Amino acid sequence: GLLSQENTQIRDLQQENRELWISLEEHQDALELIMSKYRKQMLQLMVAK
Amino acid sequence: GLLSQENTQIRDLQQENRELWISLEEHQDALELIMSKYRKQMLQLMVAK
Amino acid sequence: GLLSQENTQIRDLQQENRELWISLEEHQDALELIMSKYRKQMLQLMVA
Amino acid sequence: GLLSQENTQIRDLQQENRELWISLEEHQDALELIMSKYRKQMLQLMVA
């Protein structure tokens, strides 16, 4: 009965779920990268001083 | 037949879906607020200069 | 001669430079905090 | 007397101050871009 309208909708919602999580995860990585670069620049300024 | 295991799972997945969206939306607001404050400070520095 | 043009302009540039450093670190703290909230929300969704 | 201690230290503080301003704006551009990508991803999910 995996082909029922309900089981098909479950798999569609699980795919949407996964896409939302990937969106959150990709932006978590972007936040970490920008913070890493921001703190590396603060250190480069201190070193040059 | 709204009480079937499948229909119950659909409503659970829709609630999860909504929670993921709220997580994305709340952080969109946080990003906007921090950028607004960041640009307002750059202007306050320019004005004081 | 601390009232020299030299020593006076030094003091103004030092004040501006201190304000720029404070601006950089205050924004650091603000981004760190929204990243903390973001990460902890993801951790909460993940075990729910 | 541009080689005065006054005028020399002025120039160093001006260079540092310019670097701090560039740092602030470069990070502005970087955050604006990740916010752009984030917002456009949400818009894409919303019409999908």
Author numbering:
A (entry chain A), B (entry chain A): 71 to 119
C (entry chain B), D (entry chain B): 71 to 118
Q: What did the paper state?
A:
Our results supported a “two-arm” architecture of the STRIPAK complex, with the PP2Aa/c-bound STRNs acting as an organizing center to hold Hippo or other MST kinases with STRIP1 as one arm and SIKE1-SLMAP as the other. Moreover, we determined the crystal structures of the second coiled-coil domain of SIKE1 alone, and in complex with an STRN3 peptide, as well as the structure of the first coiled-coil domain of SIKE1 in complex with the first coiled-coil domain of SLMAP. SIKE1 functions to bridge SLMAP through CC1 on one hand and STRN3 through CC2 on the other. In particular, we discovered SIKE1 as a key adaptor that recruits MST-bound SLMAP to PP2A-bound STRN, forming a molecular arm MST-SLMAP-SIKE1-STRN-PP2Aa/c.
To further characterize the assembly of STRN3-SIKE1 complex at the atomic level, we solved the crystal structures of SIKE1 CC2 alone (apo state) and in complex with an STRN3 peptide (residues 166–190) at 1.5 and 1.75 Å resolution, respectively. In the apo state, SIKE1 CC2 formed a symmetric homotetramer consisting of two parallel homodimers (chains A/B for one homodimer and A′/B′ for the other), namely a dimer of dimer with two dimeric units clamping each other in an antiparallel direction. As such, the N-terminal regions of SIKE1 CC2 formed a dimeric coiled coil, while the central and C-terminal regions formed a tetrameric coiled coil. Residues Q79, I80, L83, L90, W91, and L94 from each chain mediated CC2 homodimerization through hydrophobic interactions. In addition, N87 from chains A and B formed a pair of hydrogen bonds surrounding the axis of the coiled coil. Meanwhile, the four-helix bundle was stabilized by an extensive hydrophobic packing of residues L90, W91, L94, H97, L101, I104, M105, Y108, M112, L115, and M116 from each chain. Moreover, the coiled-coil assembly was further strengthened by hydrogen bonding among residues S93, L94, and Q98 from chain A, Y108 and R109 from chain B′, and Q111 from chain A′, as well as salt bridges formed between residues E102 from chain A and R109 from chain B′. As a first step, the SIKE1 CC2 homotetramer observed in the apo state would have to disassemble, producing two homodimers with an exposed binding site for STRN3. SIKE1 CC2 alone exists as a homotetramer (dimer of dimer), but forms a 2:1 heterotrimer with STRN3.
